[PDB]
Design a protein around this nucleic acid. Structure first.
Ligand SMILES: [Mg+2]
Ligand SMILES: [Mg+2]
Ligand SMILES: [Mg+2]
Ligand SMILES: [Mg+2]
Ligand SMILES: [Mg+2]
Ligand SMILES: [Mg+2]
Ligand SMILES: [Mg+2]
Ligand SMILES: [Mg+2]
Lengths: 110, 58, 117
RNA sequence: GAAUUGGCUGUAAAGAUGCGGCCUACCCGUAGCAGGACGAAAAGACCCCGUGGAGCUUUACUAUAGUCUGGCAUUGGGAU
RNA sequence: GCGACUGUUUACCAAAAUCACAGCACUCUGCCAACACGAACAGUGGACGUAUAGGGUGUGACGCCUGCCCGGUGCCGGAAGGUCAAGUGGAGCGGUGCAAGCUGCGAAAUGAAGCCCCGGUGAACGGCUAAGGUAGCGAA
RNA sequence: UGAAACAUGAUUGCCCGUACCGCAAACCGACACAGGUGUCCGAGUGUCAAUGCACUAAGGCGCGCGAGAGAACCCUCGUU
RNA sequence: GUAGGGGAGCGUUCAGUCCGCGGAGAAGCCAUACCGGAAGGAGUGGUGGAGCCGACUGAAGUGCGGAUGCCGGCAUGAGUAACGAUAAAAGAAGUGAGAAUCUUCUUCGCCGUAAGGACAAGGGUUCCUGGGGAAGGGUCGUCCGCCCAGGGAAAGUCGGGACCUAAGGUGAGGCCGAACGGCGCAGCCGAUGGACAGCAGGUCAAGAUUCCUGCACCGAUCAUGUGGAGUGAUGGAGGG
RNA sequence: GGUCAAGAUAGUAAGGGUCCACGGUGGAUGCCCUGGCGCUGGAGCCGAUGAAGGACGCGAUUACCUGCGAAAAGCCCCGACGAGCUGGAGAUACGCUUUGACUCGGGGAUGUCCGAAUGGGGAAACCCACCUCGUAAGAGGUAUCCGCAAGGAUGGGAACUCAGGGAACUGAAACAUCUCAGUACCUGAAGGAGAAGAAAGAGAAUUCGAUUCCGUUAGUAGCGGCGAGCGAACCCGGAUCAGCCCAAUCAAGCCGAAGUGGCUGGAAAGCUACACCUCAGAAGGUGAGAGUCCUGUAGGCGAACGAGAGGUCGUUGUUCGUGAAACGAUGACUGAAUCCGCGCGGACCACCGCGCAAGGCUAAAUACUCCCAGUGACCGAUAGCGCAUAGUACCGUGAGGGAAAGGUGAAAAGAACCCCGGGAGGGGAGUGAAAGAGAACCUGAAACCGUGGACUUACAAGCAGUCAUGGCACCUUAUGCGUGUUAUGGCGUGCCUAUUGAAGCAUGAGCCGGCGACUUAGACCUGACGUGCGAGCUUAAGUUGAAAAACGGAGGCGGAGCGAAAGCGAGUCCGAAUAGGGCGGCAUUAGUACGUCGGGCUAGACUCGAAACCAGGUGAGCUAAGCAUGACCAGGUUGAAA
C-alpha cells in the first residue's frame, strides 16, 4: 500500500508555521499548523473544518451529536508564506544560533 | 448405482407446467363479533379470547 | 506478450445470440445451441429462395385455372391458347388479372378458344 | 445435446417419439407399475489387434549371485 | 462321498475335500555341521544345541498293506580310456636393421573340475520302446 | 577420648501429572456416524447354578424434526 | 466440393512513429431497423468514471462449442428422497420478541454385568459462573459439547522422575565395510514387570490419599541423652 | 321486436411461450497496484567467542506478525537529522522529545531454552549430576578428534566445482552390443568460485612452448550389431596472460534554478493570456494530465569514522565398442636403467624427430546464482512465484502434497438524530462531486431466479426453424420501410467425431464465463519471395563505444572435374587405345550475405492420456508374524491315571 513516500516523509514545514492552502478548496485560506504528520503527509491547520458526529455508545451518558473538528490535508498547502502569497524557499544561512539554518523566498524571513 | 435417473434436464417451462398447482389458498378470515379483529371460523379469537364469552385468557 | 481473448469473444457471441429471437428456449438464450440452430438455419434460408420461386408460380397456376375453369376451359388448355396467339404473352400477372378483373380475364379466356378450335 | 419427448405399418447404417403413409390425442398435475427411452453406472473384465505391459514356467537365448575347480600371492623350514 | 481327530484360511462374493497335524519314509549334516540372513576371512541365527540332533522333501490317526519297469533325467559310487582351460614348453613361420639385437605369429607333449563311459538307486523325476499293473477298489 | 544403633525434641521435604470426556455427541471412524477401544466395580427378587433370563434399586436415559392418516406396495412381527 | 495445395484479407495484445481524443466525461458494459463481399465497422442513446480511437510499420502466450478437457458460477432431478436404530410420551407451571423442541413440577416408558460407576489410552479446557444468540446442532431453540469473558486444577507418602532391570535400543575402547555406513563386551537408555512412607472424614459454582480437620508414617540434617564401641565397600554369599 | 330453428364466431388462462422494462444472483470485462518473471550488472560464505533454523518469553491492553530477549517492540557510545515520536493496526490511557527524541549510518553491551550441540540422559526446546569461584542469589567448566603449545576440526549453505558409487524408461520401429549416460539419483570434500596448471606435451614446421574459456577447424579425421547413431585434435582468430619452489571510489546525508491571472470543475498541474528556468523537460506525488507546488533530478558538497617406470592377466579413458590398436590408467602377479642414460612420436624395426616421468604451491580470464540494483515490443490477479503472500488452511501415520483470496472516497468527512424490527435489514435526514461510492463499498458481462407490460396459447403429434400471408402492437439509424409478436400454409432427419455409409437406438457433451493445442532453437540442410553487393560475397569470438554502432577476415560459400586411391586435369576413371560412365564446351546462362516465409533435421516438438521400468527415501501406529513383560476365561456337565 505504498503511502506518503512518493514525497519523502518530509514535511516542508513545522507544526507551528502559518500556511496558505493553495489548490483544492480553501485556496489561499491560512492558518497555524497544529499537526504535522510527515509519514502520511497529513497537516492539521486551523483552516479547513468539519462537523463530525462522535460515535460514543455507552459512553457515560452519550449525548453525542456533531463536533466541529479540523480535517487534515496533504501537500495541498504550500508551507510558509511572507509576501502573503505562497512562496518557495531557498536563501538560508544561520543566526546567533549558527547551530541552525533558516529559509526564505524572494525576501528573507520565516 | 443410482438406478433410475432422468434422461434430460427439464425445461424451465416444463418445470413450471408442473408447479401450476402449488399456490396457497389464503385463509378465509372472519371478523370477531367482539374486538372485531379477524378470526378463524370455528376457532377462538386470538385477540380477545372469545367464542361467545371469553374462553382463553386475555 | 500474453494476449487474452477478452471482449473479443463476448462480442462474437452476442452477434449470434442476438440473431436468435423468437427462437424457443435455450435456442435463443444459450450460445452453443443458438448458434448451432443457425447452421440448420443456413440450410433453410438459402434453399428457401431458390424455392419460394417454386411456391409462388404454384399459387399463380392454381388461380389461373379456377377462373379458366370458371368459363369452361382449364389452365392446360387456356395457357396453350394464349400461346397459340404469340399476340398474348402475360402469364406473369395473368392470375391476378383472373383474380381481380373478371371482365378482363373472360376476354383472354374466349380469346384463346378463338385461337383454339 | 436441446425438446413443442403418441400408436400402427413401412423406410432408413439392418429394433425410429422428431423420415413416409394412416390412426389416436383438450391443457396441468397426484399416487402407483416398470415394457421402451438399444434407460444409469464402469472409454466391455469375453474376443481380436498392439513388433504394449506384467506375474509365472522351462532341457527358449543370454548373463549373473552363488558355487566346484587349475595356476598365482599371503606361505615357510626338513627328507624320497 | 471326502477329510482321521481339535485346529487353520481367501480383512471387503470361496471355511471347504484347502492348509496344519500326531504318525511314516527318503536324504543331507561331525559341529566355526548341513542350512540361511549379510557390503563383510564382521556379526548372527541354527544351538549356549551336537545325530535317538538339526536341515530339507514328501505322506498324513489307526488298520491290512504298498507290486512291476532303472532305457531316458537326476542323485551316489566306480572309473581304464576319449575329449577339455589358463599355464608350462620351444621348434616352425615373418618383420626391421649393416649388425649385434629388438620385435609379430605359433605346434608337440604336457595340464583341474567336468562331459562321454561302467554299475547302482523308485516313500527319486517318471513309466505300467526299460517294463509292462501283485493286492485292493471300479460308469467312482 | 568423642563409633555404629535407640529414643526425645527440632528443621526439612525437590521436578512432572493431577479440571472435563473417557464402550463415547469430548478417543479412532470426513459427519454431535447403529461400528471399533484395554482394565476394574457391577445391587435385589425369583429360576439346580450363573457375570444366563425376566422384572427392578442406585444411578442413567426416552436416542435434536413434529403432527395426522390407516390405501396399493416394502420391511419386521402375531394367528390361520 | 472432403484430405491437400495456392491467393486476398478481418480481429486481439504488445512496440516504434504520425494525427489526435477525454471529468460538459476514456476504456469496459448494455440497446439498435446503418455500413462493408466476409472476417468485421460506424452512428446515436444508456451505464461508467478514467485513461483512450484512427493510420503506417514491427513482434506475437493472437481468434475456440466440442477434447468423459481445466477452474468458477448457476441450473435439472424437486421441494422430491431423506432428517441416522419402532426405549413412547402427557399435562401443568415458568421464561421469552418468538418455543413441540429451554427450565420447574408431577406422571409415564427404556437400561440396570448396563444405555450405572472408576480408570487407561487418546483428546484438550471440552470443566464451573455470567453472558451470547451469526454459523455448527440433519427441525425449533430463549439451549448446547457451539461464540465471548472471567474463574477452576494445590500432594514428603497416589503414578512417573531424582532407584532397578526385560525384549529391544545404544555402545568408549574392538570386529567389518566404495562412500553414507554395518556389527559389538562392559556400561547406559529402556515398562508393560521389581522396589517403596498414610488413613478416616469435611467441603468451593468448579480440585481432593493433593486444601482443612483428627490422628499417623518415611528419609534426611542438627541438638540432647543413652551407649559404650568400630564402622563395614562399584567385591563374596543369602534373598529378591 | 320477440320465440323457435340452422349456421357461424369471439371472449375468459390454471399454467406456459416470445419480446420489452426493471431488478437479484454471479463474477467475466476494462482501468488500476500495494505482487511476480527474465536478463544485465553487483555481491558471494555463516558457525563452539556456538550458526542455520527453531521453543518459551518481553509489551498499560496483545491472540497474529515484527523487533528483541529478561538489561527483552529494547540498553551505551560516535556520527548523521532537525519535531516529531509513541511498530504493522488502524484504539484509549500513560508519556517521551534541543542538556534534540524518532529515524538512518557505524561500533559495543545484553542475548533464557533447543539445535553440530558437545556435563550425563533424552521420544528437540526437557530431566538429572559434579568440580571450582561465591553474599547467597549468581558465575564458570565439565564432548569427541589432531597437535608440547597456541590453535585447528565437527554443523549449515539455492545453484555452480571435483571426487567416490552410478540407473532405467527411451532409441535401434522387436532385442542381448550399442543408445538414453556416465545424464538422473546417492555419498564425500570445498570455495566464492572451482577444477587445471609450468611438458618424460602437442605437431610434421627440424613449429608451437603452463592451465583454463569463447570462435573456428568439423560434423572434417575417425568410432559404429561399420546399424541406430556417437564424434575429436592441430593450425588460426580472441578473453587472459606469472611462474616459482623442493629431494640427492561505494553507504547515512546536506545544498540545489524557474509563475501568475482569468476560465471550466466538486477539485485543475487541463484551457487561455502573458512570464521565467534549463551542465538539472529522468521520475513519483498533489481532489484530472505536474520543467517553474512538494519530493526529486543536473551539478556541488559530504563525517567521527566504515568498507574495498616396463610387462603379463583382468578392465578402462581419449573418436578407440578388440580391432593390426598405441598411449594413458590400475586390481593382481612381477620388476629396469641412468648418457657413448630414459619416454614417446598409434602394432613392430631402423633411421629421423619432440620431451626429460615417479615432490610440491600458484594469480587471472571460467561457472552458478540465496541476496542486491537497474532494466524489459514480460505478466498485471483462472496472468504472474504456490503465495498481491501462505507453504498457512486444508489432506497424509509419514516421506509428502498444498489452496482461494485485490479495488469505499480526493479526504472518513464512514452515516449524529428519527421510522418499522429482538436482530438482521431497510426508509428518511445529514456528509460527499457522486451513496445512479456505505463499508457482504471501482466496472459489474453471461448462465441462472423473479416482478410488471405487450402479443399469444387449453382437436394438439411437435430438432424446434425457414419461406409466405393475414391479425395485433409499436414506430429515436424507423411511419415509409420497417421493428416486435403472433395465426395458418409449405418446406424441413441437432452439432461434432468416426465412417463404405450418421437424425441416428454409434462417440462426446447439463448451461454460461473465463483458461485451453503445430511453437521455440540451433553461424544446421533445402527451396519461394525480397534487399545489398556481384565474379566475387560474408563475417564468428571479441574490441572499443552505446539515451547510438563502428572496429574485428581466424573462418565459411562461388571459383574443375574425374577416380577406391596414387594421382591426373577440362579432362578423368574402365582397358593393354579408341565402346562407354561421370565432367567441361554445348546457342546459353554467376553467385553470395541478410530477411519473411514453405518444408527437412535434431531437441518435450501440434495438446492431453498409459499399463510399466529405474533411483533415493517414507511406512509393521492397519495387517502378517517374532521377542520381553502383564492381563482374562459366569456357571454348569463328565469323570482318566493313581
Ligand atoms: Mg420401483
Ligand atoms: Mg476336516
Ligand atoms: Mg473345526
Ligand atoms: Mg409420522
Ligand atoms: Mg465447453
Ligand atoms: Mg478483475
Ligand atoms: Mg509470499
Ligand atoms: Mg466406440
Amino acid at each position: 500500500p505504498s503511502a506518503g513516500s512518493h514525497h519523502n516523509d518530509k514535511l516542508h514545514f513545522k507544526k507551528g508555521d502559518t500556511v496558505i492552502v493553495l489548490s483544492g478548496k480553501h485556496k489561499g485560506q491560512t492558518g497555524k499548523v497544529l499537526l504535522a504528520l510527515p509519514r502520511d503527509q497529513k497537516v492539521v491547520v486551523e483552516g479547513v473544518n468539519v462537523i463530525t458526529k462522535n460515535v460514543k455508545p455507552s459512553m457515560t451518558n452519550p449525548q453525542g451529536g456533531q463536533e466541529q473538528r479540523e480535517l487534515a490535508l496533504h501537500a495541498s498547502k504550500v508551507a510558509l508564506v511572507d509576501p502573503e502569497t505562497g512562496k518557495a524557499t531557498r536563501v538560508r544561512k544561520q543566526i546567533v544560533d549558527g547551530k541552525k539554518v533558516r529559509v526564505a523566498v524572494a525576501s528573507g524571513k520565516t | 448405482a443410482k438406478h433410475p435417473v432422468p434422461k434430460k434436464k427439464t425445461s424451465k417451462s416444463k418445470r413450471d407446467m408442473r408447479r401450476s398447482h402449488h399456490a396457497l389458498t389464503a385463509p378465509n378470515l372472519t371478523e370477531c363479533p367482539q374486538c372485531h379483529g379477524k378470526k378463524l371460523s370455528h376457532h377462538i379469537c386470538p385477540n380477545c379470547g372469545y367464542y361467545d364469552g371469553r374462553q382463553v385468557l386475555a | 506478450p500474453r494476449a487474452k481473448t477478452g471482449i473479443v469473444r463476448r462480442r462474437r457471441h452476442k452477434k449470434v445470440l442476438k440473431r436468435a429471437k423468437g427462437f424457443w428456449g435455450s435456442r435463443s438464450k444459450q450460445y452453443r445451441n443458438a448458434f448451432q440452430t443457425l447452421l440448420n438455419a443456413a440450410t433453410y434460408e438459402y434453399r428457401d429462395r431458390r424455392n419460394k420461386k417454386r411456391d409462388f408460380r404454384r399459387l399463380w397456376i392454381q388461380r389461373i385455372n379456377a377462373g379458366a375453369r370458371l368459363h369452361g376451359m382449364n389452365y392446360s388448355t387456356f395457357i396453350n391458347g394464349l400461346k397459340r396467339a404469340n399476340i398474348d404473352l402475360n402469364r406473369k400477372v395473368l392470375a391476378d388479372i383472373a383474380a381481380r378483373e373478371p371482365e378482363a380475364f373472360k376476354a383472354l379466356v374466349d380469346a384463346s378458344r378463338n385461337a383454339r378450335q
